[PDB]
Design a protein around this ligand. Sequence first.
Ligand SMILES: Nc1ncnc2c1ncn2[C@@H]1O[C@H](COP(=O)(O)OP(=O)(O)OP(O)(O)=S)[C@@H](O)[C@H]1O
Ligand SMILES: Nc1ncnc2c1ncn2[C@@H]1O[C@H](COP(=O)(O)OP(=O)(O)OP(O)(O)=S)[C@@H](O)[C@H]1O
Ligand SMILES: [Mg+2]
Ligand SMILES: [Mg+2]
Lengths: 580, 11
Amino acid sequence: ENFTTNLNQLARVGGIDPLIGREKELERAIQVLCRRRKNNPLLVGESGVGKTAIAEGLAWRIVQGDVPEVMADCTIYSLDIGSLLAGTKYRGDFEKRFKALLKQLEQDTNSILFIDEIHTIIGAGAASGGQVDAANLIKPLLSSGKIRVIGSTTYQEFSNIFEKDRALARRFQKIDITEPSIEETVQIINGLKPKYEAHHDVRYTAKAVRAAVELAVKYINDRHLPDKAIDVIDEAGARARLMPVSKRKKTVNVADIESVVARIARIPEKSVSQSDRDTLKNLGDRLKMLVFGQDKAIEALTEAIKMARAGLGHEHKPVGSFLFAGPTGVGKTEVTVQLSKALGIELLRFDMSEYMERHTVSRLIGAPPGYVGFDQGGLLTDAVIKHPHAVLLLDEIEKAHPDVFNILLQVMDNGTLTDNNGRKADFRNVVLVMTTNAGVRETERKSIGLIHQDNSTDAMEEIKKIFTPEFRNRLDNIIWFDHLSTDVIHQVVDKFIVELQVQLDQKGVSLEVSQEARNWLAEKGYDRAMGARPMARVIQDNLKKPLANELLFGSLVDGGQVTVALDKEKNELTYGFQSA
Amino acid sequence: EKVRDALKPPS
Ligand SMILES: Nc1ncnc2c1ncn2[C@@H]1O[C@H](COP(=O)(O)OP(=O)(O)OP(O)(O)=S)[C@@H](O)[C@H]1O
Ligand SMILES: Nc1ncnc2c1ncn2[C@@H]1O[C@H](COP(=O)(O)OP(=O)(O)OP(O)(O)=S)[C@@H](O)[C@H]1O
Ligand SMILES: [Mg+2]
Ligand SMILES: [Mg+2]
């Protein structure tokens, strides 16, 4: 009938891809096909392993004749459950169709029914009245054993649906199918290759198949090995096929497959381009013009990035894990924010002051216990999944509950944080930076003595008290931030003034500041303990406040050409406004 | 609690 599909006929015309390997799996199924009791086999394994292909592959082998003589003539049919229910509008239509099919099979005694997703029949034909389920109709024949059927299910299934009804499970013989080894996968791809080569009119290199399996399992962790490798191979041919010329590349070579894996895994590709090569080269100076001082922190951040792109990087850890500690007003956070801008990647920020309670930490990995809503996603895992190449900033990590550290421990050591739903987040390309203010009180503390002692070591001890040895062992570097020097402050003043000029440019105002005035601001605003934040306040009172009055009501409403100069006699600035 | 129902006419 139309519902049934003779797989053997399909193979005869090339409609089923050939099977490679899995001889033990076929032998276990064939041994079960011929056993007196529990004749029905069940193919159970994870998605994308080959369970469906094995059932179709069996028919392919039969037509070829490389099967046991007992199974020399065994027709394998495929049930289309959708077609069974297509016209079952009137009462008894489902039974007539299903019973007509079973009668056909028992008469032959050679025909075998392959039913994919066997768990689906557990509720078919349950409209109303008789409520004759499809499993109920098949159960009598299966118990006797006159009819042989083949099933397929996932590990998710076979526990929640099929195993509920012991009547069906007892008859079926479970078979465990596991993904093949890396070496086995290369053999499989080589066997399927001629069909993919013809479709795309390209020749895959021997090394390319090894790279596809090795690269995909290494970076593509959301799928199983057989389909995962085949996906890369299928896409690689299409990429070459769509070149502007009819066929720019008639064959696929190593380092071409890498491009496909990069798009699928959203990881930076190897063979770095001149555009990104120059960016990494200038990533040490571009940051030094925005963040002054703390050169040791910039080098640690850029070297870890350069290493990963070069190919020398941790196998399972992230690109780099750093802890930024030190006094206030120093560029602990700013350097992280500017890093993401210099690299052109998404910045993931997480103010850890909002994760003090234990339940808050859970939100990162998953929703609350038994959350009624469907949005059971995690905040940390989703962000990393959405942006695998990013800067994972965790400011004020000290405030966060200790549980957060236990989460980062597996991240720094394994690079993957599985979520409640089973999705695996990849941290291999996400920079992990954590800023802490632990021991900041010691930095500003003044000793009881003529000389003010350093107190930096005391602050480090406090840091060690909170961050256990395990956490500090997995950190690539614990960069301490030195206090801002006078020379640095002068550079910082230019930065804030430039920002002021940008705000003024939006109002058609141009500001010129004499060098003498800049030093006056630096001297007045320089505070070693408080860093650079006071400088911003000094700019507000001296520069922004007079300008604000003029901008709102004065010569600078629609004008500009402001000229500031400091008179030495009164050590006070002189604001000159031109109406323009 | 809300579940769809599929009916069948007698003939
Ligand atoms: N010789 C082979 N060995 C292993 N896997 C293969 C082989 N040939 C093809 N495959 C893969 O197996 C796929 C067929 O589907 P399966 O891997 O059996 O999973 P499935 O039955 O679709 O899984 P569900 O939906 O979870 S029941 C093909 O599209 C390939 O990805
Ligand atoms: N090295 C620096 N060069 C230029 N501006 C800086 C520097 N360090 C800090 N700033 C400025 O100071 C302000 C705050 O800098 P951040 O790095 O965000 O401070 P922070 O390290 O988070 O502070 P705490 O007190 O330690 S939480 C911003 O205006 C920054 O631009
Ligand atoms: Mg399948
Ligand atoms: Mg900070």
